[PDB]
């Protein structure tokens, strides 16, 4: 069980750790988060009490290094940093735990929610979408645009999601225009799965990462990517049975976790209605269809 110590908390902030969140008061004796489950990526996220604008945060995996948070009064945010001195780090953490100045990652033993939201998400894939190669963790915020949003402006600060565009030469073979537009199997299976992602695990990892950035940061470009990757599968007549069954599980947990009060901004009516009621896969997503009809019958 790993620890992300905080140097201090000089500004009042709501702190997120995965699907959990805690309020910290200005200059509260808060020195971090302990008992973080090993084996998963994690995200530690912030919303300042005095400017709720810019949710921001850090994707990390405690297996890759010793990370801590320290407020920067110049740049006005909580920054993740790596401690290269193992013994300094172990000594800091032991002291803060002894003084009980840390919140415990509040996992219920029965509760697979975080695993179910991050099953295919790998830190090495996150670091290719979010390019800052000198850190082992990845910064994301509410405002960051996607490579696709930028084509339609600072390249270093972009989310490099895989570009999906249904009306593009990549998506449509010369001479198979109607076939490829109405049945996206070519685009899904040959271009995306065999060509770019190499396997369904990497495709699902990106889909899951996009959803979590949409949900945790209200990142609009991430929401667009999440829906495009759903629509590409649902709009394909030929999808391996294992991928459909896995997608149903993936979407079920995403819909389960979504705050009820953000459904209006985080869910695209057209995509979900098309995916559940008109697409080739309209009858393939039993679990997802059932939770959507019971939780969000207004959207449909």
């Amino acid at each position: 069980m790993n620890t992300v110590p905080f140097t201090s908390a000089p500004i009042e902030v709501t702190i997120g750790i995965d699907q959990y969140s805690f309020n910290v008061k200005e200059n509260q004796p808060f020195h971090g988060i302990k008992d973080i489950p090993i084996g998963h990526v994690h995200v530690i996220h912030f919303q300042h009490a005095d400017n709720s604008s810019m949710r921001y945060g850090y994707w990390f995996d405690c297996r890759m290094g010793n990370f801590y948070i320290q407020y920067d009064p110049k740049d006005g945010l909580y920054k993740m940093m790596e401690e290269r001195d193992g013994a300094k780090f172990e000594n800091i953490v032991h002291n803060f735990k002894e003084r009980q100045m840390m919140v415990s990652y509040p996992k219920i033993d029965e509760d697979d929610t975080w695993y179910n939201l991050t099953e295919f998400v790998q830190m090495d894939k996150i670091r290719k979408i979010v390019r800052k190669d000198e850190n082992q963790f990845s910064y994301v915020d509410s405002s960051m645009t996607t490579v696709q949003e930028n084509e339609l402006s600072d390249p270093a600060h972009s989310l490099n999601y895989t570009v999906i565009n249904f009306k593009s030469r990549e998506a449509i073979r010369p001479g198979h225009e109607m076939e490829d537009f109405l049945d996206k199997s070519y685009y899904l299976n040959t271009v995306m799965l065999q060509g770019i992602f190499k396997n369904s695990s990497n495709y699902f990892g990106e889909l899951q990462f996009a959803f979590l950035n949409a949900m945790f940061f209200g990142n609009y470009g991430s929401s667009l990517q999440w829906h495009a990757m759903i629509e590409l599968i649902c709009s394909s007549a030929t999808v391996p049975k294992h991928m459909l069954d896995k997608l149903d599980e993936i979407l079920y947990y995403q819909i389960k976790t979504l705050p009820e009060q953000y459904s209006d901004i985080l869910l695209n009516e057209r995509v979900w209605n098309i995916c559940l009621y008109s697409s080739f896969q309209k009858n393939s997503l039993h679990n997802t269809e059932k939770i959507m009809e019971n939780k969000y019958p207004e959207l449909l």
Binding site: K167, R169, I172, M178, F181
Partner: protein, 237 residues
Amino acid sequence: GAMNSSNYAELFNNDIKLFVDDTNVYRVTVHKTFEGNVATKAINGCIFTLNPKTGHLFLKIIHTSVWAGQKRLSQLAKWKTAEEVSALVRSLPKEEQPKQIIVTRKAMLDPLEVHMLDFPNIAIRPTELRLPFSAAMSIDKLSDVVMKATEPQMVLFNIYDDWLDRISSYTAFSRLTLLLRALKTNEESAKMILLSDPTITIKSYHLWPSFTDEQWITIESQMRDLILTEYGRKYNV
């Protein structure tokens, strides 16, 4: 975006553009079967592709053989239209290729956009104009070449005959739309008006009669009267 009354003069500027109308591509007669079910029989159709500045009409005849063994023909008809417009553009020299293609029906936008991905600088646009191009098959010489076709064929016409020698392309387009609206509202009465005087004929190389300028004013008035006479029936006003 969409072409309407506000940007109407744009049709007659020096940027090459084509209207595409797909309403006569897939045409059927509906009939009873021996068993008392209903079936369709396809008849030959056409794509109506018109340069409104020059009057050049690219009439691609759609022979019934293109539907043989195909499903969802009303969907396929939009894609076949977009395939044939794309083929026509590729066949034209670069300097004759349109800068814009205006589709008369919004359902043609995605098919045509997808077929024209190779031409990112050709704008594909809808229109808010209600254009009567469905009535093209009320022009006897166009109906005749479509119905006689035994194979796919492209035939080139000038839908304005020699009008541009005497009138602008704005006025020529307005005359054409009034003629086609009349033919669409009451075909029998419109054809009567166009051919009632046997001394005015249609030249071999023309679609419409050889009206003098004064005779076109009388004809145009008779077509407006026909349209208002018919409107005073539809709506009982």
